[PDB]
Design a protein around this ligand. Structure first.
Ligand SMILES: *[C@@H](Cl)C(=O)N(c1cncc(Cl)c1)c1cccc(-c2cc(Cl)cc3cn(C)nc23)c1
Ligand SMILES: *[C@@H](Cl)C(=O)N(c1cncc(Cl)c1)c1cccc(-c2cc(Cl)cc3cn(C)nc23)c1
Lengths: 306, 306
């Protein structure tokens, strides 16, 4: 037992991280087969980055303007192209460490692991969620752009995120691996800002089930509620609506604990109206919304990856 | 910016994990050079595990009683011996993926990453602290014994922990890699139990500095306090004492923020006496004590590992 914010083993991804330099800008790239993926703002300078035309900027570059270093071994760039907000740098060597992989785009409310990197060297790993407003609450310093987020499903790495920027509030924004931003953010200096977030309701319920599975039960009650009457309270407290699909997805956790989904909603209702009154759940004094029903089943049942 | 519970990249350790089977018991082992390290209770059965004599049990075993699987490749055991509570299984192949490494024993209050494993396959990675009572609050299911905890310093893996058991309260206990338990726990079925824990004071202060570095300042005040008068309050709330050495170690974080160490103690004093009153710090409504001063400098400054 126990319940922790768990990331996927990062090794398969560590073997893909490289350093990409163009002019005075150094950042991280992802090396799969014979292509290195990196944020296209690598080709911009400080004054470029104000209001740039990336097609103009890129036609002025050459293969030899991109230094790629894979460890202490230089990769030779033999072609380059832009796809949306990422650069694709064709190199003369296929990455011998290429895992089986897919490029997938996730939904707000879904989680993923982040391998933070600087100068192509992995620094740390942690677990994030895509917020309903398409930001993530990460940990990123200057030079971390190009770090990726991913999930692992048996032996296959599903890359979902490439880091691009930090917004004024300290939250982070980036793209999927086809270079399409998550949310209404651009790789130009504007006054862009996050926008109002909500709490991921289905995830809080999943975590409440994790808590029961791990022996925290003080928040349970004999009450129940209808889906509609719960949603009227959820809206009040800036929680997103709960759908029948969410109820179905919470099915297995319901059956394992014997607490009907709508009963746990009644428990959440009372937590929202009363607060926690000195007590904690799974070592938290807040309702945690960055674990999916999948994450809870995985951690509380023990699936591995190979 | 941002601040997350960050683990070290786990790849160097993933390449050392193997499966060890003896009789009907399967668990994880650590394969470095030509030795596989695993918990010695692998040789026990259910009724053995009540009150066992491990020297007796081990002299009755043979090399061929230990099946070691490194992925889908069987390793041949050519020798075995016991060191304290671990087994050392000499195999006929040196692990080609052996990193530079050290076996180190950590102090309560220090942190480390855990690579949870089942059947020799890595499952997830997360960050723990050694509690003052020599337990850790982990996430471990049946079959995870033999998973290890570690830190990385440039390119060298310092292994500090091998998982052995879960105590009745849901917390976890194990050994260093020489097989000496952390704390007063034994690998026999007794009624052993955790014992009273305290909060790691120097770590809370480190995390308060992390918060200031990341823009949370509402808890700051103009007050100050003496070391002795702070410690009188710390004891009341079950915090461990703060020493001049802790003050010296908080030096760099003090200088970076311009908040004298003793001033931040005055801030903590008031948080302890008043609570947080609806507010949060770094996304927590509790005072977090599982980040060291080292961890904060690392994350808020950006060191990598290669
Ligand atoms: C890589 Cl060069 C990099 O990591 N960052 C960065 C990312 N996350 C946090 C922090 Cl503090 C820095 C980075 C550095 C310089 C500029 C930018 C950047 C990126 C975009 Cl997409 C837009 C934009 C607009 N401005 C002024 N800077 C931007 C990111
Ligand atoms: C490996 Cl066999 C294993 O992972 N565990 C285990 C570890 N952590 C959590 C859980 Cl729920 C299980 C394990 C399985 C069976 C027995 C033991 C064990 C270990 C020790 Cl050191 C002592 C002891 C006493 N008893 C009754 N079981 C014990 C651990």
């Amino acid at each position: 037992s126990g319940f922790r914010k768990m990331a996927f083993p990062s090794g398969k991804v560590e073997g893909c991280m490289v350093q990409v330099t163009c002019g005075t800008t150094t950042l991280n790239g992802l090396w799969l087969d014979d292509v290195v993926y990196c944020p296209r703002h690598v080709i911009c300078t400080s004054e470029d980055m104000l209001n740039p035309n990336y097609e103009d900027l890129l036609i002025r570059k050459s293969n030899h303007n991109f230094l790629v270093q894979a460890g202490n071994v230089q990769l030779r760039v033999i072609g380059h192209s832009m796809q949306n907000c990422v650069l694709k740098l064709k190199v003369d060597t296929a990455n011998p460490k290429t895992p089986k992989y897919k490029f997938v785009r996730i939904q707000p409310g879904q989680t993923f692991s982040v391998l933070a990197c600087y100068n192509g060297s992995p620094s740390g790993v942690y677990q994030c969620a895509m917020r309903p407003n398409f930001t993530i609450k990460g940990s990123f310093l200057n030079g971390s752009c190009g770090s990726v987020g991913f999930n692992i499903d048996y032996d296959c790495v599903s890359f979902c995120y490439m880091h691009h920027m930090e917004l004024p509030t300290g939250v982070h924004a980036g793209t999927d691996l086809e270079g399409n931003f998550y949310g209404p953010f651009v790789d130009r200096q504007t006054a862009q800002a996050a926008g109002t977030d909500t709490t991921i309701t289905v995830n809080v319920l999943a975590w409440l089930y994790a808590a029961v599975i791990n022996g925290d039960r003080w928040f349970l009650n004999r009450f129940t509620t209808t889906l509609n009457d719960f949603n009227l309270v959820a809206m009040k407290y800036n929680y997103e609506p709960l759908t029948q699909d969410h109820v179905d997805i919470l099915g297995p956790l319901s059956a394992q604990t014997g607490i009907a989904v709508l009963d746990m909603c009644a428990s959440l209702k009372e937590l929202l109206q009363n607060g926690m009154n000195g007590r904690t759940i799974l070592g938290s004094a807040l309702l945690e919304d960055e674990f999916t029903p999948f994450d809870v089943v995985r951690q509380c049942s023990g699936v591995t990856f190979q």
